[PDB]
Write a protein that binds this ligand. Structure first.
Ligand code: 1KI
Ligand code: 1KI
Ligand code: 1KI
Ligand code: 1KI
Ligand code: 1KI
Ligand code: 1KI
Ligand code: 1KI
Ligand code: 1KI
Ligand code: 1KI
Ligand code: 1KI
Lengths: 55, 55, 55, 55, 55, 55, 55, 55, 55, 55, 55, 55
């Protein structure tokens, strides 16, 4: 076989899960957050996949 | 087989789940948030997939 | 087989779920949010798939 | 087989769900929000798929 | 076989999970956060995959 | 076989899991955080994969 | 002060919430159930406060 | 002060929450259940407060 | 002070939370269940407070 | 002071939390369950407070 | 002071937490379970407080 | 002071935590279980407080 990509690719066979991202956010997984009190200014309480590039 | 992509591709066979994103947000997964009190200015309480690029 | 894409593609066979996004938001998954009080100015309380690019 | 796309495509066979988006928003999934009090100016209380690009 | 990529690629066969990211965040895994009180200004309480590049 | 990459690639066969990242965050693994009280200003309480490059 | 009860009482002052039950069911709290498929004969899918005394 | 009870009482002062139960079920707390597929005959999927006394 | 109870009592002062139960079930706490597939006959998947006295 | 109980009592002062139980189940605490697949016949997957007295 | 109990009592002053149980189950504490696959017939996967007296 | 009990009592002053149990299970402590695969028939995977008296 032959393949040429510029990116971003994701090429496969017999594949149970696939995610391609440029951005941006993708949530595909099981996630449970239980929480009782959030205070403070300002605290990232429960972050799973996170990116902060403030300018 | 032969394939040429510019991106972003996601090419496969026999594949249970697929997500392609440029952006942007995609939520495909099970997610449960239970929460009782959020305060503060300003706190990201429960973030799963998150991207903040303020300018 | 042969395939040429510019992107964004998502090409497959025998595939249970598919999402293609450029944008933008796509919500296809099970999601439960239970919440009792949100305060503060301004706090992202419960974000699952999120993108903030304010200019 | 042969396929050439400019994007955004989503090409498949035997496929239970499909979403193509450029925009914009698409909601196809089960979603339950129960909520008791929202205050503050201005707090994103419960966001599932979200994109904010204010200029 | 032959392959030439510019990156970022992810090329495979017989592959159970795949993630390609440029960004950005991708959450595909099981995650449980249980939490009782978050205070302080400002403390990253529970971060799983995290990136902070404030300027 | 032959392969030329610019990076970042991840090329394989018969491969159970794959992650490619430039960024950014990717969470694909099982993660359980149980927590009772977070205080202080500001303390990284429970960080699993973490990167802080404040300028 | 003086008090004599036979039960079931609930006596208080300055009290934000009160429930007295003999029975029976009382639901006063925030509750969110999101659900996609229930099968089987017969499975209690999502029970919060539950009592089964079949004879 | 003086108090004589037969039960079940709940006597207090300055008290934020109170529940008295004989039965029976009382749900006063925040609860989020997100769920995707329940099968089997018969499996208690997600039970929070539960009592089964079949005869 | 003086107190005589038969039970079940719960007597207090300056008390943030109170539960009295004979039964029966009481749910007053924050609870998040996220779940993707339940099978089998019959398996208690996620039980928090649970009592089974089948005869 | 003087007190005579038959049980079950719970007598106190200046007390943040109280639970009295005869039964039965009481859930007052923060609880997060995230789960991806439950199989088998029949396996107690995730039990927190549990009592099984089958006859 | 004077006290006579039959049991089960729990008598105190200045006391942050109290639990009295005859039964039965009481869950008052922070608990996080994250889980990916449960199989087998039948295996107690993750048990925190547990009692099995089958006859 | 004077005290006569039959048991089970728990009598105190200035006491941060108290548990009285006859049964039965009580969970009041912080607990985190993260788990990836459970198999076998039948293996107690992760047990914290456990009692098995099958007859
Ligand atoms: C193997 C492969 C296969 C492949 N298949 C495609 C789509 C076909 C199609 C089939 C039917 C359609 O209708 C359409 Br539209 C499209 S792209 C693609 C790319 C590749 N590679 C780059 C792998 C080479 O490994 C080099 C590493 F050294
Ligand atoms: C400067 C910049 C540079 C940049 N470079 C990229 C790589 C693309 C690529 C990806 C994979 C490839 O193979 C190739 Br070739 C190329 S995205 C990107 C975004 C930015 N920004 C400043 C947008 C942030 O918005 C401001 C916040 F408000
Ligand atoms: C990482 C971080 C992230 C973070 N993110 C925010 C979002 C605000 C917002 C964003 C978007 C909105 O729409 C609104 Br309203 C509000 S505050 C904040 C604070 C922090 N930290 C300081 C902890 C770093 O610790 C360094 C060493 F200790
Ligand atoms: C500067 C920039 C740069 C940029 N570059 C991209 C890469 C595309 C690509 C992706 C994959 C590829 O293979 C190739 Br080639 C190319 S998107 C993008 C967006 C931006 N912005 C500033 C928009 C933010 O809006 C302002 C917020 F209000
Ligand atoms: C400066 C910069 C540089 C940059 N360089 C990249 C590499 C791409 C690549 C990746 C893989 C490759 O093989 C090749 Br070739 C190339 S992304 C990127 C983004 C930026 N920014 C300043 C955007 C941040 O936005 C400001 C926050 F508001
Ligand atoms: C502890 C246990 C508990 C347990 N509980 C069930 C509930 C069924 C049900 C109960 C109520 C309902 O309404 C329905 Br429908 C269904 S199966 C089960 C199995 C077990 N074990 C096998 C572990 C014993 O260790 C063996 C060797 F060590
Ligand atoms: C046999 C029995 C006995 C029993 N004993 C109790 C104690 C009360 C007490 C509690 C605290 C005290 O201080 C004193 Br004194 C007394 S409840 C109770 C319920 C039963 N049942 C068989 C009902 C189950 O229904 C059948 C299922 F379908
Ligand atoms: C046999 C029995 C005995 C029993 N004894 C108790 C103690 C009360 C007490 C509690 C505290 C005290 O200080 C005093 Br005195 C007394 S409850 C209880 C329940 C039962 N059963 C068989 C009901 C189960 O139902 C069958 C399942 F379907
Ligand atoms: C100290 C105490 C205090 C107490 N107070 C009650 C309710 C008053 C009330 C007050 C106002 C009302 O309106 C009502 Br109704 C009722 S029962 C009780 C029991 C006791 N003890 C047994 C402790 C003795 O320690 C012996 C150990 F050695
Ligand atoms: C046999 C039995 C005996 C028994 N004894 C207790 C002690 C009370 C006590 C507790 C504290 C004290 O100070 C005093 Br005095 C007394 S409860 C209890 C329950 C039972 N059963 C068979 C019920 C199980 O139901 C069948 C399952 F389906």
């Amino acid at each position: 076989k032959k393949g040429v990509v510029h990116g971003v690719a994701t090429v496969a066979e017999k594949t149970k899960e696939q995610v391609t991202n440029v951005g941006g956010a993708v949530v595909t997984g099981v996630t449970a957050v239980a929480q009782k009190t959030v205070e403070g200014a300002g605290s990232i309480a429960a972050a799973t996949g996170f990116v902060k590039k403030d300018q």
